[PDB]
Amino acid sequence: TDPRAKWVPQDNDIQACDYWRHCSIDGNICDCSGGSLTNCPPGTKLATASWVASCYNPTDGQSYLIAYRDCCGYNVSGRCPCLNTEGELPVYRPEFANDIIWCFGAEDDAMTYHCTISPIVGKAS
Amino acid sequence: TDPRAKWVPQDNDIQACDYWRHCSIDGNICDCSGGSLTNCPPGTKLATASWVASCYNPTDGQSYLIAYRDCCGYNVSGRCPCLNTEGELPVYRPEFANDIIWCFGAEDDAMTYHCTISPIVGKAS
Amino acid sequence: QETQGQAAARAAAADLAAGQDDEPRILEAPAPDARRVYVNDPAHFAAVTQQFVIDGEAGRVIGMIDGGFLPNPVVADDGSFIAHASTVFSRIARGERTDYVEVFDPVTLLPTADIELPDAPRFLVGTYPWMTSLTPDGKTLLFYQFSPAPAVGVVDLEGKAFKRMLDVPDCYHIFPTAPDTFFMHCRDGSLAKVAFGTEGTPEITHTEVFHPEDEFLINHPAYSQKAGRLVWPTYTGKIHQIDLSSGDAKFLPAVEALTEAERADGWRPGGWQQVAYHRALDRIYLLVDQRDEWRHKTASRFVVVLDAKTGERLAKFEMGHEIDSINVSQDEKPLLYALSTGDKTLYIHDAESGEELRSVNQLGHGPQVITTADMG
Amino acid sequence: ETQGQAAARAAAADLAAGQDDEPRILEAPAPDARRVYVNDPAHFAAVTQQFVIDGEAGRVIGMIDGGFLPNPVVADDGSFIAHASTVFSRIARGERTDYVEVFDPVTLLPTADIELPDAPRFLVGTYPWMTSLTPDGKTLLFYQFSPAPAVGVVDLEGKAFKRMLDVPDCYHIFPTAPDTFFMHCRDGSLAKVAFGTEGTPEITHTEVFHPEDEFLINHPAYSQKAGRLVWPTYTGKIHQIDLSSGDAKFLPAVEALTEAERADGWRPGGWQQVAYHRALDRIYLLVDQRDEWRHKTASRFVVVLDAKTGERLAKFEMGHEIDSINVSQDEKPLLYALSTGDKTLYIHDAESGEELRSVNQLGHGPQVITTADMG
Amino acid sequence: ADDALAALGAQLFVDPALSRNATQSCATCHDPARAFTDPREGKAGLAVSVGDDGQSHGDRNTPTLGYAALVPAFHRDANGKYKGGQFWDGRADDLKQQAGQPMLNPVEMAMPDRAAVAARLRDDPAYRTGFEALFGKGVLDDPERAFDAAAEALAAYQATGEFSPFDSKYDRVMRGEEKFTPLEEFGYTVFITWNCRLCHMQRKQGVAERETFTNFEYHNIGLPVNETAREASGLGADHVDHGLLARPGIEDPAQSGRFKVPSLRNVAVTGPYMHNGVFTDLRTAILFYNKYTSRRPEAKINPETGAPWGEPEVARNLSLAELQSGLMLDDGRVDALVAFLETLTDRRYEPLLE
Amino acid sequence: DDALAALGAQLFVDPALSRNATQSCATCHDPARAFTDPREGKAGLAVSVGDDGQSHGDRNTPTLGYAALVPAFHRDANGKYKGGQFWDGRADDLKQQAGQPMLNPVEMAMPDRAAVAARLRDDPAYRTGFEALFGKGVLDDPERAFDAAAEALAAYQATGEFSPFDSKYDRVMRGEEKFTPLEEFGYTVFITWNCRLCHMQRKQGVAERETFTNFEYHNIGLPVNETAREASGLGADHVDHGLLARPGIEDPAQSGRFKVPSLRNVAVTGPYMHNGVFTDLRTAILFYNKYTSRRPEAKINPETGAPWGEPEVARNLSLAELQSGLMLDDGRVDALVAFLETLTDRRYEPLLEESRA
Ligand code: HEC
Ligand code: HEC
Ligand code: HEC
Ligand code: HEC
Numbered sequence A, B: 001t002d003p004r005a006k007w008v009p010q011d012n013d014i015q016a017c018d019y020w021r022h023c024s025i026d027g028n029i030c031d032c033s034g035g036s037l038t039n040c041p042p043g044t045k046l047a048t049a050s051w052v053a054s055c056y057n058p059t060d061g062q063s064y065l066i067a068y069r070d071c072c073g074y075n076v077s078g079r080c081p082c083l084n085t086e087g088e089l090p091v092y093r094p095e096f097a098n099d100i101i102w103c104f105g106a107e108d109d110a111m112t113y114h115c116t117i118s119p120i121v122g123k124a125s
Numbered sequence C: 001q002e003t004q005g006q007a008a009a010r011a012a013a014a015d016l017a018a019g020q021d022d023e024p025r026i027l028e029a030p031a032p033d034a035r036r037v038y039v040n041d042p043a044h045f046a047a048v049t050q051q052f053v054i055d056g057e058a059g060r061v062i063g064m065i066d067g068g069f070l071p072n073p074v075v076a077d078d079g080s081f082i083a084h085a086s087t088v089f090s091r092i093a094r095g096e097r098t099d100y101v102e103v104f105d106p107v108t109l110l111p112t113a114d115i116e117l118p119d120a121p122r123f124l125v126g127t128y129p130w131m132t133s134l135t136p137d138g139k140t141l142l143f144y145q146f147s148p149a150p151a152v153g154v155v156d157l158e159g160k161a162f163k164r165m166l167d168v169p170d171c172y173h174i175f176p177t178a179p180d181t182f183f184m185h186c187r188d189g190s191l192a193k194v195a196f197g198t199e200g201t202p203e204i205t206h207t208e209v210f211h212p213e214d215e216f217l218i219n220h221p222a223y224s225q226k227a228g229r230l231v232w233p234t235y236t237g238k239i240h241q242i243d244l245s246s247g248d249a250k251f252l253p254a255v256e257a258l259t260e261a262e263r264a265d266g267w268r269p270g271g272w273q274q275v276a277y278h279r280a281l282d283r284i285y286l287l288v289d290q291r292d293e294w295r296h297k298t299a300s301r302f303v304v305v306l307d308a309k310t311g312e313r314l315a316k317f318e319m320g321h322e323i324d325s326i327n328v329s330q331d332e333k334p335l336l337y338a339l340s341t342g343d344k345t346l347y348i349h350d351a352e353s354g355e356e357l358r359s360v361n362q363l364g365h366g367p368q369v370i371t372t373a374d375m376g
Numbered sequence D: 001e002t003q004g005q006a007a008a009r010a011a012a013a014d015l016a017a018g019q020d021d022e023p024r025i026l027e028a029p030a031p032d033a034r035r036v037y038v039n040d041p042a043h044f045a046a047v048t049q050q051f052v053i054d055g056e057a058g059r060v061i062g063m064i065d066g067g068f069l070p071n072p073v074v075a076d077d078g079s080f081i082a083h084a085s086t087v088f089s090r091i092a093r094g095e096r097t098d099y100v101e102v103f104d105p106v107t108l109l110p111t112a113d114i115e116l117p118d119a120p121r122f123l124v125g126t127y128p129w130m131t132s133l134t135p136d137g138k139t140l141l142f143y144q145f146s147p148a149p150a151v152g153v154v155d156l157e158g159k160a161f162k163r164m165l166d167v168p169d170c171y172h173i174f175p176t177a178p179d180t181f182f183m184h185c186r187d188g189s190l191a192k193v194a195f196g197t198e199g200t201p202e203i204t205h206t207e208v209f210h211p212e213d214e215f216l217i218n219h220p221a222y223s224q225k226a227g228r229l230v231w232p233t234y235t236g237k238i239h240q241i242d243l244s245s246g247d248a249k250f251l252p253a254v255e256a257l258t259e260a261e262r263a264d265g266w267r268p269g270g271w272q273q274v275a276y277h278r279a280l281d282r283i284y285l286l287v288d289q290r291d292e293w294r295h296k297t298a299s300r301f302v303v304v305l306d307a308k309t310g311e312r313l314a315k316f317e318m319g320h321e322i323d324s325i326n327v328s329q330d331e332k333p334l335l336y337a338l339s340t341g342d343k344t345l346y347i348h349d350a351e352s353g354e355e356l357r358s359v360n361q362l363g364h365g366p367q368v369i370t371t372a373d374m375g
Numbered sequence E: 001a002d003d004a005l006a007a008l009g010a011q012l013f014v015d016p017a018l019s020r021n022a023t024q025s026c027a028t029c030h031d032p033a034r035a036f037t038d039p040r041e042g043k044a045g046l047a048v049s050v051g052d053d054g055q056s057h058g059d060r061n062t063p064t065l066g067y068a069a070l071v072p073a074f075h076r077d078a079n080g081k082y083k084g085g086q087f088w089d090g091r092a093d094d095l096k097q098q099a100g101q102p103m104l105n106p107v108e109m110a111m112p113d114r115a116a117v118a119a120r121l122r123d124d125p126a127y128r129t130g131f132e133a134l135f136g137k138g139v140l141d142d143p144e145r146a147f148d149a150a151a152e153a154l155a156a157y158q159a160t161g162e163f164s165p166f167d168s169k170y171d172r173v174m175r176g177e178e179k180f181t182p183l184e185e186f187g188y189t190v191f192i193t194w195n196c197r198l199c200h201m202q203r204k205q206g207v208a209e210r211e212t213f214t215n216f217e218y219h220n221i222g223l224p225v226n227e228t229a230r231e232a233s234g235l236g237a238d239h240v241d242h243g244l245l246a247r248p249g250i251e252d253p254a255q256s257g258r259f260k261v262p263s264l265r266n267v268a269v270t271g272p273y274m275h276n277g278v279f280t281d282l283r284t285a286i287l288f289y290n291k292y293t294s295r296r297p298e299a300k301i302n303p304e305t306g307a308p309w310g311e312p313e314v315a316r317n318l319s320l321a322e323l324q325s326g327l328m329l330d331d332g333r334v335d336a337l338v339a340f341l342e343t344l345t346d347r348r349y350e351p352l353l354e
Numbered sequence F: 001d002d003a004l005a006a007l008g009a010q011l012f013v014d015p016a017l018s019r020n021a022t023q024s025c026a027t028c029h030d031p032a033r034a035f036t037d038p039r040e041g042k043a044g045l046a047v048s049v050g051d052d053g054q055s056h057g058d059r060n061t062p063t064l065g066y067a068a069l070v071p072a073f074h075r076d077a078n079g080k081y082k083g084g085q086f087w088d089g090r091a092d093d094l095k096q097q098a099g100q101p102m103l104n105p106v107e108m109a110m111p112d113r114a115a116v117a118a119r120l121r122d123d124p125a126y127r128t129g130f131e132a133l134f135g136k137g138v139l140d141d142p143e144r145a146f147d148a149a150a151e152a153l154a155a156y157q158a159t160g161e162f163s164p165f166d167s168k169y170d171r172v173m174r175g176e177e178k179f180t181p182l183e184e185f186g187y188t189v190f191i192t193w194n195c196r197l198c199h200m201q202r203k204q205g206v207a208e209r210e211t212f213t214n215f216e217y218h219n220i221g222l223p224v225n226e227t228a229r230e231a232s233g234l235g236a237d238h239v240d241h242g243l244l245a246r247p248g249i250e251d252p253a254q255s256g257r258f259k260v261p262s263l264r265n266v267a268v269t270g271p272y273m274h275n276g277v278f279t280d281l282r283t284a285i286l287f288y289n290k291y292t293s294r295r296p297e298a299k300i301n302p303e304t305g306a307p308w309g310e311p312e313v314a315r316n317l318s319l320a321e322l323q324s325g326l327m328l329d330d331g332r333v334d335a336l337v338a339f340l341e342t343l344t345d346r347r348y349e350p351l352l353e354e355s356r357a
């Protein structure tokens, strides 16, 4: 895969970096360390904060806002790492910025990065 | 290149795992993180403990005892990793055993493993 | 043919199309069972480390546990908890050292105890499973200390407290046989039986010397606590077996894992966890390859399987990868686990046919130790 | 001969001569213009490493351990280095401690360890100008994002945290005096922040210097000694701001890529995409052909342009996937080119672009190069 | 018959004959010109409403009836949480159960009893025809049938497209008919990524077909007593409004102080805000959330009074997990959230925005 | 060269070098006992008795074997004091040491350089021997005569007789013999444990003439030897400051440091340490476990059954080297004893069989 070519989504494998909901994920896919597409692994803490992206779903033609919430309180999983940046803006527009550790709100003040989930939170405007 | 082949020492490059003094080294060569063949890198603490091996010097045809002293107090360097086990015996013969962290005696009670030096300490026999 | 990732994508797509709502949450692992397998990554001596909890049947990571410097993992055979003894420093790898035991719930993976060990008493060594060991009732954890001298620390898991250090002779490893008794292997080639009460010097008794000074017993023997069977290979693939089930050591007939012709063609065991033992089948599994005599910690590409009673070879498998550690699930039709430190991958095989069934990659930096529970 | 060969010959000669030497802890060589630091955030691991490298010999001369996403800084005059770092009581869980360590640059021993109360650091993939030293070396300033943009003031000379400064919705810290620094604001102005030993800081904004549809990258170059802030956008337009007087003077924007190159898919991309050489007044930018939203991927090329005129001076084919670049600040500089994927620092002649040497095995995901401007 | 029942409801909704002194109908307090809320000034301003006796004030703010037909009947959801119902405290299971309560409440429409209500229904010949066509001969001679039938009709009327048109700017934007302004778009993005989404969106994940900007759950956000409304209601200086714990069948003290998350549709035109009408301005209601996150001293002050917000009426069971998000809304994001909330105004109330 | 050494051979066993003619160098440095003192005095074998037959020293008489390999006193490349003669290095070299026992009233007790020169003038073979090497009238000048005798004695001590390198250890290193399994284990422990930090000539590399000492000065924290201290008559208040007693050393950090002794012939030159406090070799080894072992027995001297005693000099201890974090179990102590016993010169192997018994 050419890293500089335009990213192409699919709706057939959530563990691959081109899964459509991972369009601005940075880190590791939680499904690969015992979470799921939208749940955190055991022993980690789900943040309430997120960065967002509008991601296109090729199965149904709709664009969705995905909230990249982190699962926190464990060292980085090291499995299924991905960094995509569709629509990603620099830190001074933080709602779209994905180098930030989006762990705020996690239980037990957890602020270390383990992995990121990719839930749909709304329709893209 | 064949990991299971008889190990063949050289006397021409101290950063390679086949350098003759490294015949029972386990870890990382200190010369690769700002130490030298027989000195520790800045900021780390030199153990007084060691495991020993008799290593043959193809240059002068003598076998020397090498005392593998660790440099401790830093996370592992990650450069120039090597594991050789010439003459290496199980843990119940600890003077010849190289899985042990030989950091005893280091200043500041340092016990974490950064790299190992390979000084000659005597003639074998 | 469909992978976990594909099945997951399909399920997510069906939920979306159906307008299914589901609350994002923290998952619980499935109940521990015979096919759960743990892989520990000592990470080539790094200051922090990871353990991966794996469903061996699916080939799926179901959880992880973080650890410090060279932790010793243990797993209760009945599946009720897992624990480790670990070591952290106040500034990454420098500063005040703290040694501690954590016990974890096997389904939430939350810590249920964190027990400090006084005076930083753990042995820091590349990881040997039997340098930290649970008693059969799961109430005590015993860890080895080397400095200033061989000693064994007693940790009460029920009352969540360190108790005391026991003085032992010049011996190594800990194989518990009873709530108050364990065996060690001594420099002199005997085993020591160590029986300890709540206070005062333990009672220590030696066996006969069972191997000579120049037969080298590897750092990774297999021990089945339920069977009281200790299986101890040497550097040449001779296998000592000790039956500790009566509470006293009985030495079984020695077996050779390799034939005279293989030994003359350079075959020797090699790796890290070189030997496994399946308790119900009474079978031994050894990692072997052709190698020079002092390349005993390199990976091996073959596994021989032998009947433990007769020494009869049952199979010889070509593993198809550079394997450092093996173990088996303890159920009927067991899995044979084959972990490659270089590939950072656990290969899961059928233990009967030898065939690779599935694999789980990206297991940290230098994974080395596979542990399973014997729940049978 | 290679370093390891030369060392083998020295050791062999000392053995043949019967030379005795005491095994001991080495000191690194004196800090000089060609020392270069490489920080490895290790893809968000809980612990991390910094590598101190003699750029002339291509040799690691030391290392420094760090915690979760530390921010490194280096005194321009070579007198010390420091970082702000974060640890936890149980690896990545439990009580968090944020702290600053200052290190002697020859022994690498910590000379201060300064606790920051209430775990105030911003945890983000590493941006150099999110933690910054004042030019007198006496104060370290660090950014806080939660609950709001704020700047912490750490007195290095008295070895104590001082206080948090409330600021507007703004980002990064570019110090210009013992008591003053600038930030980039969301509204597109810079904010000048002047702070006393207490009292709210005095905050004043420049004019808005870029519209809302131009995106200014997270890794600008800033030369404190030249006062020059060099700030690329996702398209390779470069803003330059002259802070040398103590106040912001805007300079004309320059384009790092031609109109035909832009039409053909060329855009900057990587991590530290831009470097600035003070004495030559030159800008270096990592560029490649790429889709518009592939801005954090590696680049295989570097363009070099005159900062006064915008004129292109060179375009180098780097021959590797490069994520970050920087330069030594001496008269004939090295151009450093760090590949996160190769974990290797490639060291080039900045004038010709030719690769002179490399230093590999730089941790897990090395990303940030820092040098001192000792000139 | 669906239409017939709602048309009977349309009639009851505006009939002051359903009040003791015949001075008020549901439309008096739920005025269609004000997104079905109360424009009338009382002793506590617009915080609480005056009933038919011209003197009794309620202790809670009159909520909109817009979109109230999208709220599920009171129940426990899949996650274990109470959800749905009607009134700020969920004490009515649904709209039909709610409807007869103002009729009989002596602080509201003040009818003495169901028989009194049936008699007003019988006194009117248009009802007799309409009720019997739907429910059967003699429906109005039986007070409990009559009263049930009235409540069903009112509930059916509230379920018509008139109360829930889905024609706000937000709706037109989501149908692809126009775009948000940059400010409105940033406001939507802030709403979605910040903690507002945790309570003010129908679903935990995925998209709603008919989004009303509430998850119908119960939360104590720690509001203070509205002093002038509490005075006006006459409930006493010692009274505590326990919210959901007043619903019969709920006994757990952990429910004390929790109220139903309101739909934010038409929020810009239905001030004053919260269950007791304590804040007059939309911006103040947004700024209140900063008290849990901001370290700036201004965040402790209610900008309408210049004084501290005040202690919570119920200082237990606050939703701190959600509220303490670790992030403060700056003034730019508060402006963006106001712009976004205004786009949830139904088309017919757009003229009310200025 | 040869002739100088042959003159020193005669002088070494000549009692005419003591005031009252009862003793020679060989009296205290007996060649049958690896050049140490077999004679029983008031503190047993811990200290020696001088020519007046009463006066006891306060230090143990050390071997002269291998003393010729010790460099002259100097500061080494690491900044450390190194070399010299006597337990405190107060003599620069052998030539400077030699005339000291001759004039010392507690040893050979000659009144002065003049009285020694008179004795040399008496023996006809000395006038011939000295003039042939030093010129006519060398013996008529007391300082010339006295320097010449010291030079002769120093040359005699540099001959092969004193440093033969023919122990079992030496024979093993050239392949003539092998270590027993116990001796081999002892050699391996000695090399890898902290003993190698002080009792090998080099920090790294190999010595061509290893004598099992780095010639440095260390305070290993020994107690006073009470019976020797009494016998020496120096007083209940006395403190042996070791290297600080050397003229021109003034730093208090040197108080209580003594020259690391060569371990060659150690199995036959008991009792041990600078004050002969320990009678048995095994006790000297066990002393080091006081710094490492956590067992209560590590605190007890096995020869007295009582605690070791406080250090005579409680500061300046070499704790970085001594506190190694590892204790010697009894099997390693046995192995160290067996190894040290291989350091016995050939001609002392029958003597060794006596000490073993
Ligand atoms: C005197 C003013 C007044 C009159 C007349 C009145 N209401 Fe209300 N209404 C209120 C107040 C105040 C509340 C909130 C009361 C509470 O939560 O306890 C309310 C709440 C409601 C609710 C619950 C909505 C929600 O979001 O929880 C519904 C439905 C409702 N009214 C419908 C009616 C109908 C139908 C009528 C005519 C039969 C009616 N109202 C008459 C003031 C009035
Ligand atoms: C923990 C759940 C929760 C969160 C998070 C939350 N709200 Fe609310 N909101 C409520 C509840 C419950 C009420 C009614 C509270 C009461 O009156 O007792 C409310 C009331 C309001 C109102 C007044 C509406 C009316 O009709 O009176 C506005 C405006 C509002 N919220 C906006 C927001 C915004 C904007 C955010 C994000 C900053 C937000 N809320 C976060 C639960 C929440
Ligand atoms: C009465 C006993 C006695 C006599 C006689 C004697 N010595 Fe000594 N010798 C000692 C003692 C005791 C020491 C250690 C004294 C000290 O350290 O201060 C010593 C130390 C030495 C040393 C230093 C060795 C070392 O390792 O430091 C040399 C050399 C030496 N003697 C040579 C001589 C020579 C030559 C003579 C004859 C002129 C001689 N000795 C006569 C008892 C004696
Ligand atoms: C820090 C330096 C140091 C270390 C480490 C050390 N020694 Fe010594 N050793 C000395 C010094 C100095 C003396 C003489 C001390 C004195 O008499 O004051 C000595 C004395 C001895 C003696 C008595 C020799 C005699 O002639 O009296 C023996 C035996 C000995 N050491 C054996 C060992 C062994 C075996 C080890 C390792 C277990 C060891 N030492 C570790 C420095 C050291």
Ligand SMILES: [Ca+2]
Binding pocket: E037, E061, E062, E063, E270, E271, E272, E273, E274, E277
């Ligand atoms: Ca209202």
Ligand SMILES: [Ca+2]
Binding pocket: F036, F060, F061, F062, F269, F270, F271, F272, F273, F276
């Ligand atoms: Ca002696």
Ligand code: NA
Binding pocket: E044, E047, E226, E227, E228, E229, E278
């Ligand atoms: Na009020």
Ligand code: NA
Binding pocket: E244, E245, E246, E247, E248, E249, E250, E251
């Ligand atoms: Na109730």
Ligand code: NA
Binding pocket: F043, F046, F225, F226, F227, F228, F277
């Ligand atoms: Na005595």
Ligand code: NA
Binding pocket: F243, F244, F245, F246, F247, F248, F249, F250
């Ligand atoms: Na002195």
